[PDB]
Design an enzyme around this catalytic site. Structure first.
Site, short mmCIF file in Angstrom:
data_model
loop_
_atom_site.label_atom_id
_atom_site.label_comp_id
_atom_site.label_asym_id
_atom_site.label_seq_id
_atom_site.Cartn_x
_atom_site.Cartn_y
_atom_site.Cartn_z
N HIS B 356 0.83 -1.21 0.00
CA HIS B 356 0.00 0.00 0.00
C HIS B 356 0.86 1.26 0.00
CE1 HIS B 356 -3.88 2.10 1.11
NE2 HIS B 356 -2.98 3.01 1.43
N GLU B 357 1.84 1.32 0.90
CA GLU B 357 2.69 2.51 0.99
C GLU B 357 3.58 2.64 -0.24
OE1 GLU B 357 1.87 4.55 3.30
OE2 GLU B 357 0.50 3.04 4.10
N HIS B 487 -13.05 12.21 12.19
CA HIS B 487 -13.07 13.00 10.96
C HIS B 487 -14.11 14.11 11.01
CE1 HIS B 487 -10.91 9.40 9.62
NE2 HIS B 487 -10.41 10.16 8.67
ZN LIG Z 1 -2.42 4.97 2.26
#
Ligand SMILES: [Zn+2]
Ligand SMILES: *[C@@H]1O[C@H](CO)[C@@H](O)[C@H](O)[C@H]1NC(C)=O
Ligand SMILES: *[C@@H]1O[C@H](CO)[C@@H](O)[C@H](O)[C@H]1NC(C)=O
Ligand SMILES: *[C@@H]1O[C@H](CO)[C@@H](O)[C@H](O)[C@H]1NC(C)=O
Ligand SMILES: *[C@@H]1O[C@H](CO)[C@@H](O)[C@H](O)[C@H]1NC(C)=O
EC number: 3.4.17.23
Lengths: 194, 597
Positions: B356-357, B487
């Site tokens: 992912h990174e 959020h």
């Molecule tokens: Zn990410």
């Protein structure tokens, strides 16, 4: 019959800025570019008009070695028929270039922790430079039409930006020392070949 | 001499100043993140303050350029991104009040703590104790207590703060010629001045509503199955036709259903795929994990990571003498410096987080040629989608077999496929109704369609209608349950997750069609396919210089969001639920409540 002082232009402790590049006139000596080509430490050597091995057994009247420091992505602009910031406002090379450029990464020498801002480049100008022309003036560039008399204001700003060279910068942003060798022919007798 | 040349010169100067300043700020923040002290925070805050002051000065200088005489699309986009005055459009006292409200809400959320009067001296905060209780506990009373207590501790203190925040943000947005703050948020997807690829700010509302109307049957089947399994687990607390209680969704709010896998497993006797043991046996470390991720990424034709990435990034926990906040993040410090700061353990979860990174870092490397203001995703949902598709491709048993982490004698059958699909659906399909409901509620509140005396009422009836989740206790207007989420209380948009979920499956289906993958979509892999890699890079290197609709068309051929790829991905699971729910009910009613007796 002495060796040409290539070490003083290649192994100098400091290099000139791209907007204030220094030109060294080397003559009345002997030169061997074989070790320069086989050094294999340079990341860029690209020219059209002479081969690196054929320019050894061929001599001219005078040679000029221009040295400066640019980014990593900005090395390609030092070539004939190229455009951009360095090609137009800092270092203009003609299309009939009989030599080529020697470039190598210098992130270890020309970059220190915090950023080595001793190298500056001209960002804006009223027009493009001529081949081998140099502009050192620091007059404030006027972007609009109203005069501002050389002070920081609207559409007026200092036309020189400092390169920020950190040791952890990318390959396209590391200080690449560029040495430009230019060769020309005149009616003067040949001085440097052996 | 025109305004175009002057704007071009101003932007050219701003780029070469902001690049260096942002690079210094990011370098200081990174030095703080790998070595956390007090002087490091001082240096980081000084650098960030310099960067913010420079940005404010440049925005003030840019505001004096009329955008009506700007023709170039890129110059117009850069000037528009720079001319966002934001909080400066109000007065000084109102701006200070807004900043005070924001900091107060952030502090109330981050330092919240609640516990029963059994012993008011010992109890844990949200992050370490309440999340664990919400995830792992199976006691109805304990989860209900934690839920109601956190709500009464946070929303009750945030309600008037959030109301003043709402009115101040509405004033700020209406001063910027916006209809409301929700319109300022939706402006991220707005495209103007481009024919065929234009996009308004109500077009996003309509697209989201249409995509959710299309999703509703799959989520309905998944909800029915989860309700059946939970009533098999909670015999005296779930109704056959009622909604799902909020405190039984695996987390504090019910954002994801990942923690319901142990209770809702289709085939418990079949162990799920886990290759951590094969990594331990073959002497796999963090360096090996990241090298395999780089090999996967270059297999599809993407360039490998630079030397600076391996030299500068922190891939392991730096011992114990020095502390570091090593949450996995992909660092784009600028000037060609990309890093990954993550404490990599030898597990499969970290094996996927590495991919992912690395996808984030590849997307960052893609548009490095764009100007400083155009170095970002097409919208606020492209980075995470590009990151998630790589992990999806890496999580397949085929890729694990190819890299040796799975023995060739592994028998991929329908049972492990259904298990993996249901896990992916609990992770993904379970969050879309919640996200849509939350963003719709916030939009309607900012638009004035919801008065103050009906906030919680409209919020909970929207929950019942859209998400299918009924609150376990009756809540009056003194609560501010929406603000309990991070959020929300920290002023962050929330539709980016919906757009991410849709775009990731669009990209996956497009690349699998380009890779000529045969069979179901959940078994697809983009590895060893340069065609799909080039198709992806064609959208990656765009940045935000072109309308996001064009970037989407560059891969999927469509000019708008598409939900057909999600259904193509989850259709085997869909048929499984359609065969399993034939003897049960599918749907929910709003009349039943957990407190109705
Ligand atoms: Zn990410
Ligand atoms: C510069 O110094 C290095 C190290 O002594 C040497 O190898 C190189 O030849 C020198 N440069 C020139 C042009 O001689
Ligand atoms: C971490 O920071 C402290 C204080 O700022 C400093 O003494 C120490 O040398 C730093 N660590 C490293 C590896 O430089
Ligand atoms: C906008 O300016 C850039 C700067 O080079 C140029 O390449 C591009 O063609 C311009 N676009 C239009 C539509 O004029
Ligand atoms: C890609 O192809 C090579 C050579 O055919 C093979 O060795 C490798 O295992 C393949 N990898 C994947 C993920 O298919």
């Amino acid at each position: 019959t002495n060796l040409c002082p290539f070490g003083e232009v290649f192994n100098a402790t400091t290099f000139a800025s791209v907007y204030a590049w220094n030109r060294k006139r080397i003559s009345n000596c002997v030169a061997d570019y074989s070790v320069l080509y086989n050094s294999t430490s340079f990341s860029t050597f690209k020219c059209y008009g002479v081969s690196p091995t054929k320019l050894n057994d061929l001599c001219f009247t005078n040679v000029y070695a221009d040295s400066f420091v640019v980014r990593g992505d900005e090395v390609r602009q030092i070539a004939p028929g190229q455009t951009g910031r360095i090609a137009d406002y800092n270092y203009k090379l003609p299309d009939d270039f009989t030599g080529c450029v020697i470039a190598w990464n210098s992130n270890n020498l020309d970059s220190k922790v915090g950023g080595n801002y001793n190298y500056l480049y001209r960002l804006f100008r009223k027009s493009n430079l001529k081949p081998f022309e140099r502009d050192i003036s620091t007059e404030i560039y006027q972007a609009g039409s109203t005069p501002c008399n050389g002070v920081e204001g609207f559409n007026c700003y200092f036309p020189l930006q400092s390169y920020g060279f950190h040791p952890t910068n990318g390959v396209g942003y590391q200080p690449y020392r560029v040495v430009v060798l230019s060769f020309e022919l005149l009616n003067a007798p040949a001085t440097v070949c052996g | 001499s025109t305004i175009e040349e002057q704007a071009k010169t101003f932007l050219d100067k701003f780029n070469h100043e902001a690049e260096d300043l942002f690079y210094q700020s990011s370098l200081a923040s990174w030095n703080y993140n790998t070595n956390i002290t007090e002087e490091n925070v001082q240096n980081m805050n000084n650098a960030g303050d310099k960067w913010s002051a420079f940005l404010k000065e440049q925005s003030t200088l840019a505001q004096m350029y009329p955008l009506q005489e700007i023709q170039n699309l890129t110059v117009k986009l850069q000037l528009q991104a720079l001319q966002q005055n934001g909080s400066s459009v109000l007065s000084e006292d109102k701006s200070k009040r807004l900043n005070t409200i924001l900091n107060t809400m952030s502090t109330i959320y981050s330092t919240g703590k609640v516990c029963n009067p059994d012993n008011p001296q010992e109890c844990l905060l949200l992050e370490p104790g309440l999340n664990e209780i919400m995830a792992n506990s199976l006691d109805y009373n304990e989860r209900l207590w934690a839920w109601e207590s956190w709500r009464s501790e946070v929303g009750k203190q945030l309600r008037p703060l959030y109301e003043e925040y709402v009115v101040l943000k509405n004033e700020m947005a209406r001063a910027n010629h916006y209809e409301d703050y929700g319109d300022y948020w939706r402006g991220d997807y707005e495209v103007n001045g481009v024919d065929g690829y234009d996009y308004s700010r109500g077009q996003l509302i309509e697209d989201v509503e249409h995509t959710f109307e299309e999703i509703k049957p799959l989520y309905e089947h998944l909800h029915a199955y989860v309700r059946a399994k939970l009533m098999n687990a909670y015999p005296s607390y779930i109704s056959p036709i009622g909604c799902l209680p909020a405190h039984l969704l695996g987390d504090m709010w019910g954002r994801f259903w990942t923690n319901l896998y142990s209770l809702t497993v289709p085939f418990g006797q079949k162990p799920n795929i886990d290759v951590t043991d094969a990594m331990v046996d073959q002497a796999w470390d963090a360096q090996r994990i990241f090298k395999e991720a780089e090999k996967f990424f270059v297999s599809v034709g993407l360039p490998n990571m630079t030397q600076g990435f391996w030299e500068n990034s922190m891939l392991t926990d730096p011992g114990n003498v020095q502390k570091a906040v090593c949450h996995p993040t992909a660092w784009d410090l600028g000037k060609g410096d990309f890093r990954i700061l993550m404490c990599t353990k030898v597990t499969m979860d970290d094996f996927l987080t590495a991919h992912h990174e690395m996808g984030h870092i590849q997307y960052d490397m893609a548009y490095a040629a764009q100007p400083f203001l155009l170095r970002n995703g097409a919208n606020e949902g492209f980075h995470e989608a590009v990151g998630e598709i790589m992990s999806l491709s890496a999580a397949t048993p085929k890729h694990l077999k190819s890299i040796g982490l799975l023995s060739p004698d592994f028998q991929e059958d329908n049972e492990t496929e259904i298990n993996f699909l249901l896990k992916q659906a609990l992770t993904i399909v379970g969050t879309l109704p919640f996200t849509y409901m939350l963003e719709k509620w916030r939009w309607m509140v900012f638009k004035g369609e919801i008065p103050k005396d009906q906030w919680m009422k409209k919020w909970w009836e929207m929950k019942r209608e859209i998400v299918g989740v009924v609150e376990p206790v009756p809540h009056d207007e003194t609560y501010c349950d929406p603000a309990s989420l991070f959020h929300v209380s920290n002023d962050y948009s929330f539709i980016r997750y919906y757009t991410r979920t849709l775009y990731q499956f669009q990209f996956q289906e497009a690349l699998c069609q380009a890779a000529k993958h045969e069979g179901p979509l959940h078994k697809c892999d983009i590895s060893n396919s340069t065609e799909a890699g080039q198709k992806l890079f064609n959208m990656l290197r765009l940045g935000k210089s072109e309308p996001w609709t064009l970037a989407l068309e560059n891969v999927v051929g469509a000019k708008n969001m598409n939900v057909r790829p999600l259904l193509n991905y989850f259709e085997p699971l869909f048929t499984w639920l359609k065969d399993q729910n034939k003897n049960s009910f599918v749907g929910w009613s709003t009349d039943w409540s957990p407190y109705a007796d």
